[PDB]
């Protein structure tokens, strides 16, 4: 994976040492929400506003 | 995001999508907002290149189904 | 395809060079009236299947073969176009400051 | 004292129309763009409906005022084509404004439209296709339902709402002459679950259900009985309470509150012993519009009787049609024939609210469309797509005629009207100049659909004309239409893109009178102050 280092290291390290894992329910749900979020912004070519 | 004043209404779309992550799963709110902001940056080159935003949306729908099967 | 097997820091600018090589035929597409988005993606896909000699016609404006229809160019022009453009592009990036004086 | 005249209006009216045209130009079609409109309410709403766009924005320009009234008349009659008419009025002014510098008088421009409108009705009757009233058309209704859905969504939700919208009209509407009522179809809005998980509700759902931990999760073949009496303790009109200082005074004071409760409750539990006592796989459900006391919560748990409280008055009137049981005001007069019939009844478990499913009925004669969404704007967009889909299918059962979409009607009509007047030459020599402007104004719709997708509008136009030329030589009938996905032409009968006859019939006549009145104003009149 990606290592933050902070002391020293050469290259990267294995994630299985620290056992840092992400649940499938969290990762799979975050992709569909982020996809629909960017879909809404790209679909809007015009914005109408009014002063309060 | 609840303690910040939002001016542009387009930002509220990402704020409403951020609350979707906190209410149901409660984890990964940073993964939703940061990834959604990068999808607009990589699309900025496609919108400028002349690729219509319609096929850009259609491309993400086909790429989303390919990602869910690999998970 | 070759840049993916190197796996180094130089891999990223190779994609910028490959995109720059595609702008020369794409510029002719913009002058031919055809869609620069559609004709560029369809032409690039034909190189992975067909030969590398399939170019773009100025008279027609659709993807056609250069050899069968009698369109040819010498290699020396291609050798002098790539070498002199890269050598000149490097010299422009070597100057980080503009000195004013006699 | 000079006779010099001015324009000062038509040039501004067309310019103001071109500005409003470009707003709804990219909003038309399934490949169009979805725009966000928020005025003063802080409520994000995204919809492509042309009528909703004009009602949510205050436009000072007088040109858009008449266009706003045109969308209101099409919704109250046709119920669709709000954006298409706006695109036809704006483009027609562009072709007519070019002839103004030539000297063409606007009256002949308006008179040339009425001649082309009457000639369009002749081609309209030959081009339309009659559809049978038979109930085997559900397969054909799937293609018609997708035409309205693909426009207002991203096309991923269409496959989910395809069986829901199709089965919504066919279930509530029996097949006869009769008529159809869209008000009988309930609409429920929930912001909890995602829109991808939405489902169709055959019965009726209610808001406030009974809350007890021992209530059964699923009850199959349950009897529905309307109960108008109060099962909860009542107090005097003036605030008062019963306070007992001893155990003997407990049953004395509390008996006054449960006197009316025990009289009705003891008669209800006797019905369970006489009716549905032995019979397995059956149930008994009490409506009880009023509240429930904590005393009856333990009685209903031992008998597994589903309890309900705080019921909507309007929903109970429709329960008599779905279930069949009449409202019982007094248990003393209750008869065994009052008990209705219902199917599997199971309540979803959610902390904020709870649902009740009366669904799976023999003759429900009603439907409920449950709208789900994660955000607020997702609920407003989905509600707009459902209401537009029901009104589009509504004209399919009423009117037996159907027309193909995807520009198949506009390209064929624009080409027919151009070659009809040249052969006949029965109108006028000067009038055909303005008639050509009407024929060229009908080709903007197929050019608009390909414009949002990035395709060349001139390329797709020449490909359709090449296919129509081969169809004129042969004596057969072949329809040609624009395919947005591939980019070439397509057969609209195979693709399944169809548009209502009533919507397109009032679209040509409606856009004719609206665009004509804008050309009749020579000078803007400012007065009243």
Curated annotation (Swiss-Prot), chain B:
Disulfide bonds: none annotated. It comes from the Eukaryota. It is found in: Cytoplasm. Belongs to the TCP-1 chaperonin family. Heterooligomeric complex of about 850 to 900 kDa that forms two stacked rings, 12 to 16 nm in diameter. Molecular chaperone; assists the folding of proteins upon ATP hydrolysis. Known to play a role, in vitro, in the folding of actin and tubulin. In yeast may play a role in mitotic spindle formation. This is T-complex protein 1 subunit theta. It comes from Saccharomyces cerevisiae (strain ATCC 204508 / S288c) (Baker's yeast). The gene is CCT8.
UniProtKB/Swiss-Prot annotation, chain C:
It is found in: Cytoplasm. It comes from the Eukaryota. Heterooligomeric complex of about 850 to 900 kDa that forms two stacked rings, 12 to 16 nm in diameter. Molecular chaperone; assists the folding of proteins upon ATP hydrolysis. Known to play a role, in vitro, in the folding of actin and tubulin. In yeast may play a role in mitotic spindle formation. Belongs to the TCP-1 chaperonin family. This is T-complex protein 1 subunit gamma. It comes from Saccharomyces cerevisiae (strain ATCC 204508 / S288c) (Baker's yeast). The lineage of its organism: Eukaryota, Fungi, Dikarya, Ascomycota, Saccharomycotina.
Curated annotation (Swiss-Prot), chain D:
Heterooligomeric complex of about 850 to 900 kDa that forms two stacked rings, 12 to 16 nm in diameter. GO terms for biological process: chaperone mediated protein folding independent of cofactor; protein folding. Its main location: cytoplasm. Molecular chaperone; assists the folding of proteins upon ATP hydrolysis. Known to play a role, in vitro, in the folding of actin and tubulin. In yeast may play a role in mitotic spindle formation. The keyword Phosphoprotein applies. InterPro entries: Chap_CCT_zeta, Chaperone_TCP-1, Chaperonin_TCP-1_CS, Cpn60/GroEL/TCP-1, GroEL-like_apical_dom_sf, GROEL-like_equatorial_sf, TCP-1-like_intermed_sf. SUPFAM superfamilies: GroEL apical domain-like, GroEL equatorial domain-like, GroEL-intermediate domain like. One of its GO terms (cellular component) is chaperonin-containing T-complex. It comes from the Eukaryota. It is found in: Cytoplasm. It comes from Saccharomyces cerevisiae (strain ATCC 204508 / S288c). This is T-complex protein 1 subunit zeta. Belongs to the TCP-1 chaperonin family. It holds the Pfam family Cpn60_TCP1. The gene is CCT6. Keywords: Acetylation, ATP-binding, Chaperone, Cytoplasm, Nucleotide-binding, Phosphoprotein. GO terms for molecular function: ATP binding; ATP hydrolysis activity; ATP-dependent protein folding chaperone; unfolded protein binding. NCBIfam families: chap_CCT_zeta. The modification Phosphoserine is found at residue 240.
């Amino acid at each position: 994976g990606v290592d933050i280092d902070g002391e020293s290291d050469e290259g990267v390290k294995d994630i299985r040492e620290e056992n840092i894992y992400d649940m499938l329910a969290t990762k799979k749900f975050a992709i569909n929400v982020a996809t629909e979020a960017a879909t809404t912004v790209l679909s809007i070519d015009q914005i109408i506003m009014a002063k309060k | 995001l609840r303690e910040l004043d939002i001016v542009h209404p387009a930002v509220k779309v990402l704020v409403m999508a951020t609350e979707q992550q906190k209410i149901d799963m409660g984890d990964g709110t940073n993964l939703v907002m940061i990834l959604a902001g990068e999808l607009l940056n990589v699309s900025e080159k496609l919108i400028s290149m002349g690729l219509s935003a319609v096929e850009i949306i259609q491309g993400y729908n086909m790429a989303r189904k390919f990602t869910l099967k690999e998970l | 395809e070759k840049a993916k097997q190197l796996e180094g820091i130089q891999q990223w600018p190779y994609q910028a060079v490959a995109d720059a090589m595609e702008c020369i035929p794409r510029t002719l597409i913009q002058n031919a009236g055809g869609d620069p988005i559609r004709l560029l993606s369809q032409l690039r896909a034909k190189h992975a299947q067909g030969n590398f000699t399939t170019g773009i016609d100025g008279d027609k404006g659709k993807i056609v073969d250069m050899v069968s229809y009698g369109i040819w160019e010498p290699e020396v022009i291609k050798q002098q176009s790539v070498k002199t453009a890269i050598e000149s592009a490097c010299l422009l990036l070597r100057v980080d400051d503009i000195v004013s004086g006699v | 004292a000079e006779s010099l005249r001015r324009d000062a209006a038509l040039k501004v009216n067309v310019t103001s129309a071109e500005g409003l045209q470009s707003v709804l130009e990219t909003n038309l079609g399934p490949k169009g763009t979805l725009k966000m409109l928020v005025d003063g309410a802080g409520n994000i709403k995204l919809t492509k409906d042309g009528k909703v766009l004009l009602t949510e924005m205050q436009i000072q320009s007088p040109t858009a005022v008449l266009i706003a009234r045109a969308a209101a008349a099409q919704d109250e009659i046709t119920g669709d084509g709000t954006t298409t008419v706006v695109c036809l009025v704006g483009e027609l002014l562009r072709q007519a404004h070019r002839f103004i510098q030539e000297g063409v008088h606007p009256r002949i421009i308006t008179d040339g439209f009425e001649i082309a409108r009457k000639e369009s009705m002749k081609f309209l009757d030959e081009f339309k296709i009659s559809k049978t009233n038979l109930s085997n058309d559900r397969e054909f209704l799937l293609q018609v339902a997708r035409s309205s859905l693909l426009t207002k969504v991203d096309a991923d939700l269409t496959e989910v709402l395809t069986p829901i919208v199709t089965d919504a009209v066919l279930s509530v509407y029996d097949a006869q002459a009769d008529n159809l009522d869209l008000h009988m179809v309930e609409i429920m809005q929930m912001q909890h679950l995602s829109p991808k998980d939405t489902t169709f509700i055959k019965g009726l759902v209610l808001d406030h259900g009974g809350r007890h931990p021992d209530m059964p999760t699923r009850v199959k073949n349950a009897y529905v009985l309307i109960l108008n009496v109060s099962l909860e303790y009542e107090k005097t009109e003036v605030n008062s309470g019963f306070f007992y200082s001893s155990a003997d005074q407990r049953d004395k004071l509390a008996a006054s509150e449960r006197k009316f409760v025990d009289a009705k409750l003891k008669k209800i539990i006797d019905l369970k012993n006489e009716v549905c006592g032995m019979d397995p796989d059956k149930g008994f459900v009490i409506i009880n519009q009023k509240g429930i006391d904590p005393m009856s919560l333990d009685v209903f748990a031992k008998h597994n009787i589903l309890a309900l409280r705080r019921a909507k008055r309007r929903n109970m009137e429709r329960l008599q049609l779905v279930t069949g049981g009449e409202a019982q005001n007094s248990v003393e007069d209750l008869s065994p024939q009052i008990l209705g019939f219902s199917g599997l009844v199971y309540q979803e478990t959610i902390g904020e609210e709870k649902f009740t499913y009366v669904t799976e009925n023999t003759d429900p004669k009603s439907c409920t469309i449950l709208i789900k969404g994660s955000t607020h704007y997702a609920l407003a967009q989905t509600k707009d797509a459902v209401r537009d889909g029901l009104r589009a299918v509504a004209n399919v059962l009423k009117d037996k005629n159907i027309i193909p979409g995807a520009g198949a009607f506009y390209i064929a009509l624009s080409r027919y009207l151009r070659s009809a007047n040249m052969n006949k030459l029965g109108a006028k020599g000067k009038t055909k100049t303005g008639i050509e402007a009407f024929a060229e104004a009908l080709l903007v719709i197929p050019k608009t659909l390909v414009k949002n997708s990035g395709f060349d509008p001139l390329d797709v136009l020449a490909m359709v004309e090449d296919e129509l030329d081969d169809a004129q030589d042969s004596d057969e009938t072949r329809y040609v239409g624009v395919d947005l996905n591939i980019g070439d032409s397509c057969d609209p009968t195979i693709e399944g893109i169809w548009d209502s006859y009533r919507v397109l019939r009032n679209a040509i006549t409606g856009a004719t009178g609206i665009a004509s009145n804008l050309l009749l104003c020579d000078e803007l009149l400012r007065a009243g102050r």
